[model samples]
Target: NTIRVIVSVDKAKFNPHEVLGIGGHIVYQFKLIPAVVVDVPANAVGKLKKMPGVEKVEFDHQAVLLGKPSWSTQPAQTIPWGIERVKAPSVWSITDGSVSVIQVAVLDTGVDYDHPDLAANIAWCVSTLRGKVSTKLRDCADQNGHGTHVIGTIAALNNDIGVVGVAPGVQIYSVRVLDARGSGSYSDIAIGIEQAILGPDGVADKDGDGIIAGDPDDDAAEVISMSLGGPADDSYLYDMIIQAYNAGIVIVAASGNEGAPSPSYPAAYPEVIAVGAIDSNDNIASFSNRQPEVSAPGVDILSTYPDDSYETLMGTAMATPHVSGVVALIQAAYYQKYGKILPVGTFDAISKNTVRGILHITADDLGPTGWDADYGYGVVRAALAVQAALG
Candidate 1:
């Protein structure tokens, strides 16, 4: 059968994992360097409408959904709708009694892997170089606080030292997509996604456990969390983003702060969930996108920050990760009930099919009792989504 080639390119030299597929034949079109993502449909097996520096072409896999966010049937916040974490009652209730340890990947700036509050739940990645491999150490590692804050929201240990996480026992993988400067290459991001779904080999494994370049079955980055974005016209980027989805990786993306009519890249793509921004009052944020599949608190939201700081930042970027963290909780709930993972890629599809699938099952409808530009299905209700997924 014909297939599509989904590759994650390198940010600097664009040295992507050159690969092909099995089908009738093969031919493809893709941008070099910065643009690592590309798709060669089955129809164009081996045509020769050649371009200048195009090296080669190949086939990959079928597309699917990964991670998506939805609201709870009831309000997650007792204080109306908010952009920051209040007390997540429903999430905590299930987490307090769950047995399975779900892993969440934060593909943003590095996490303070050793933060006083997040140390215990951090799941380190495995690293490989020159045919040598090792296990990862997430010790006080994050340079920027964004990730640490996110970790707090998702699985921050409920120890007496600090804040309690929405799902404290859930595991987390810090896939550093963005550098300390809050910027990253699309290729680096793709690698991060691969590590999250495919496991620690794409990242760092500090203990030399023979995981990365050695063994295949090691620490797996089960949940892929992304909060950054670029432009929307790049299908090259879209393909890589979707690859993670096809691999059963759950992806959660921010709708963006541009305040425009369109969703951001990757998230703007067909299979990714585009989360919009809302304020404490449940009204959409002024700087958030209306094209999002769902809405969540973003404006004036507070959480951990860099240089030992935490602030109330405003943007959909902050909101998206919260949804990602919640996804891990949902996975944990199901695993606990069934005593095994759910139908392999079911969560993946649910995550990308527009937060609409989740919103429909959760949140109370606002503005005409249906999907609208302001709130795709309405605000994301975490508790309800997890309950529905578990059931």
Candidate 2:
């Protein structure tokens, strides 16, 4: 058997005939490096090494294209089940909800805005707990872990860490309506809605067109997401919902988890899009309330929790953010295409009613033919909804 090797030799004394006489085949000769690539009988290697002017003999190693090693560290980022189930990544090529800086107001039990996966996307935060509003980020810290989970599902950063959201890297306005124990009054919830409409400027009607959303001067969030609600239907809460809807903000809420015949409070209101829960297999969750506007993945849904961690939770509460995230994607895609936010109330402009209608049309229809109580329109589809919005 012959062996290939790189032979370093003294240039002045090296001669090709010497190697040829020794039954060696020279593959390459390097004039500058004083080396020669040769193939020779394995038993003759020692004889070649001892030749005059030969400095050293080394084995020629095969080179290959570079790539990650098999033992490399695993990736930290993961697309949650709900995010993929809704087909969010399919529409990311068009707009990942980062083009127009779409902001979603997460009105819930506060959010861990400082969480590594969510910090980059949290644009503003406020706490409306106990009827007192505070603009400090710390004041809105998530103590119950529910709000953090909801926000992560809506707009966690696309960076390779923890987990990614449906509307990856979109802006979030955390409006803490619930306290530490995940309980809050209707008045606080209403206050949270009002703050969401006001935005960072604290102005309810910025342009004086009787509409707060879609105005260039107004910083109002384009969407409001509520994962918490009560059985009692308060008039104030309903009025707030109507006001928010009229201002062109798309509202999404969770159908209660009591397995009841209907949804709870704000979600029960016609202005709010009620979301039910479905497992990965597309079956309606037993504990999810019926008669929702749409269903989304909820069982074993993984998302960010407080203290820079992640957890898997199951409930309609987990499903609401998926629809909210889809709404953000739709609005962002529309904005990217038209170079402006969707105007309110104009015949040609996309409004809350228009988005709701699009969602109903593009949803993955489940159960009965159309408009069933369990699945409503069906699971909210992000790619199809974004496509419709772009059109």
Best by TM-score: 2
Report, for every candidate in turn, its global Cα lDDT versus the true structure.
0.54, 0.78
Model 1 misplaced stretches (Cα beyond 4 Å): 1-87, 96-101, 125-140, 201-218, 232-236, 307-309, 342-356
Tell me how far the alpha carbon of residue 166 in candidate 2 is from the true structure, in angstroms, after superposition: 0.6
lDDT (Cα, tens digit) per residue for candidate 2, span 140-192: 88888888888999888888888889998688999987777777765566667
Candidate 2 contains a number of clashing pairs equal to 0
Q: Candidate 2: minimum summed lDDT over ten consecutive residues — where?
A: 63-72
List residue ranges in candidate 2 displaced over 4 A.
1-75, 209-211, 342-353
The numbered model that scores best in lDDT is: 2
